[PDB]
């Protein structure tokens, strides 16, 4: 509905800057690291598969976690409780049928109690001051997809795949805004599947060029090439499915020619 498409994209560009986490929060976290963060987000991918949640739900939860951890120190033994609550809030915000609280307690193999999850939901809401409607990589890609000619499912699914992978690794992806990770992912997907590139209509829309996308693109291409050897594998497993046209089984390009 192009009547509001430009108003919406402009508003989300404003909000991604306000909802952005602190880039260097991991350093100030005494008891957790990027690796542990990586384990958690990889687990949230699994949960999202067990319960058939939207990809948008995963993205939002990660946003919430990163924002929560930008101001609250957490013990390692409580990281999964923050994560659990964030996924519950994300599900309540985004899902037609969110999973019930008992199901979230159960997926932590009773590491936590229902009361703990519920109390951690409140604190998370408090720390985020109820500002849950955050922009995601997902929300931007979906707009960028309207610019394919013609639409290509494989491109769409490989872009999502790539975007998902960027959730796992706070270094370096925390540096980049959702709209920029989306740009890199879309271009990478398109190049890989069709050899086309970041289209001119998206330059006009976003103001981004391949030049401005280069830094994120360079990281993302390395991530895509190293993906079979990454310690976390739930996203590759996921995208081997038919729902996603098996795009994790596609071969990444050895060079991007930039």
């Amino acid at each position: 509905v192009p009547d509001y498409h430009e108003d919406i994209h402009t508003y989300l560009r404003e909000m991604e800057v306000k909802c952005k986490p602190k880039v260097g929060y991991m350093k100030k976290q005494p008891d957790i690291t990027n690796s542990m963060r990586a384990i958690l987000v990889d687990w949230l991918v699994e949960v999202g598969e067990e319960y058939k949640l939207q990809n948008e739900t995963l993205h939002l939860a990660v946003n919430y976690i990163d924002r929560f951890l930008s101001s609250m120190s957490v013990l390692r033994g409580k990281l999964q409780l923050v994560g659990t609550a964030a996924m519950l809030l994300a599900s309540k915000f985004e899902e037609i049928y969110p999973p019930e609280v008992a199901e979230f307690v159960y997926i932590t193999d009773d590491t936590y109690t229902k009361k703990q999850v519920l109390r951690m939901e409140h604190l998370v809401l408090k720390v985020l001051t109820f500002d849950l409607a955050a922009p995601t990589v997902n929300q931007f890609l979906t707009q960028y997809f309207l610019h394919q000619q013609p639409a290509n499912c494989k491109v769409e699914s490989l872009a999502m795949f790539l975007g998902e992978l960027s959730l796992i690794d706070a270094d370096p992806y925390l540096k980049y805004l959702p709209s920029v990770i989306a740009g890199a992912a879309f271009h990478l997907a398109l190049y890989t599947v069709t050899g086309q590139s970041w289209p001119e209509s998206l330059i006009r829309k976003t103001g981004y060029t391949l030049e401005s996308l280069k830094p994120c693109l360079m990281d993302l291409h390395q991530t895509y090439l190293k993906a079979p050897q990454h310690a976390q594998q739930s996203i590759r497993e996921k995208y081997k499915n038919s729902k996603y046209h098996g795009v994790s089984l596609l071969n990444p390009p050895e060079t991007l020619n930039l």
């Binding site: 384990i39 999964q80 932590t108 193999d109 590491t111």
Partner: peptide, 6 residues
Amino acid sequence: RNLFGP
């Protein structure tokens, strides 16, 4: 699955 806990 339990994560960072015992």
